[PDB]
């Protein structure tokens, strides 16, 4: 029910920066990369309390629809109702996420894109602007 | 060009594109609205396309079909640059803002609830969108 972009041609090495504020009563949000709804290299879904965890950010990819290997982090810099900024990098062997605290990890390149085309947003978060390179 | 959907701007909301003229531009495309074929706003900057030079063409499209163009005096534009465009909307007029803050309104011929879908083409390339 997010924000859905698409033909976004992000390549290796450029910045996707994106801006939101989050709900007072979040339980998780989304952030999704990748070819399409169903190739995502990247499943961003920081939980709040949600989906069986407690402020943790799980990360995932997805190929020809199926879920691939959860990553979770040990840290969690959101809080609710904050406003937050995330952003994202790739080349061939990683992902590198920078989160609101200037924390960065690597999530493994699992699909092996040209580019990036495709992100969507969804639960508790509401977009407010979005950057590309 | 890019192309967003679920958007959900409202009435009121402001939504600011920035992007990059392409530096032998012909010409370039915003649109907004419901889907491609139902847009309340097609924003097209001419720098030299379709028929004119420096001006900006607007228009609606309603189940596929182009409505009655409406020409601005001003083109405020410039190939190989950074451009900004504001735009927000009631009932009866979509608001445009351009880059040296000069204003003009555009009819709402489609009276949507919200819009919920934004394209670019042509000679732009989208770096920036912002929805307050
Ligand atoms: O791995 C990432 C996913 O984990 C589970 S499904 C699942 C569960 C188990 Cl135990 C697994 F082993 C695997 Cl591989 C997947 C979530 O339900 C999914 N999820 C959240 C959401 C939204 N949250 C907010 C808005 S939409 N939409 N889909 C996704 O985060
Ligand atoms: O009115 C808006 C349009 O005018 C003409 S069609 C047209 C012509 C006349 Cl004489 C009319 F009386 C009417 Cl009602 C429509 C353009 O060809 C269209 N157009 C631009 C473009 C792109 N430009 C860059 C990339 S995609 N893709 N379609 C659209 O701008």
């Given at each position: 029910?997010?924000?859905?972009?698409?033909?976004?041609?992000?390549?290796?090495?450029?910045?996707?920066?994106?801006?939101?504020?989050?709900?007072?009563?979040?339980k998780s949000?989304?952030?999704?990369?990748?070819?399409?709804?169903?190739?995502?290299?990247?499943?961003?879904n920081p939980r709040f309390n949600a989906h069986g965890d407690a402020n943790t950010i799980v990360?995932?990819?997805?190929?020809?629809?199926?879920?691939?290997?959860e990553?979770r982090?040990?840290?969690f810099?959101?809080?609710?109702?904050?406003?937050?900024?995330?952003?994202?990098?790739?080349?061939?062997?990683?992902?590198?996420?920078?989160?609101?605290?200037?924390?960065?990890?690597?999530?493994?390149?699992?699909?092996?894109?040209?580019?990036?085309?495709?992100?969507?947003?969804?639960?508790?978060?509401?977009?407010?602007?979005?950057?590309?390179?």
């Open positions: 029910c997010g924000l859905v972009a698409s033909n976004l041609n992000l390549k290796p090495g450029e910045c996707l920066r994106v801006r939101g504020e989050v709900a007072p009563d979040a949000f989304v952030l999704n990369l990748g070819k399409d709804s169903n190739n995502l290299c990247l499943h961003f990360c995932n990819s997805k190929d020809g629809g199926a879920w691939g290997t990553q982090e040990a840290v810099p959101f809080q609710p109702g904050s406003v937050a900024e995330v952003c994202i990098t790739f080349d061939q062997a990683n992902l590198t996420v920078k989160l609101p605290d200037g924390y960065e990890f690597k999530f493994p390149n699992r699909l092996n894109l040209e580019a990036i085309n495709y992100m969507a947003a969804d639960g508790d978060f509401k977009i407010k602007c979005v950057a590309f390179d």
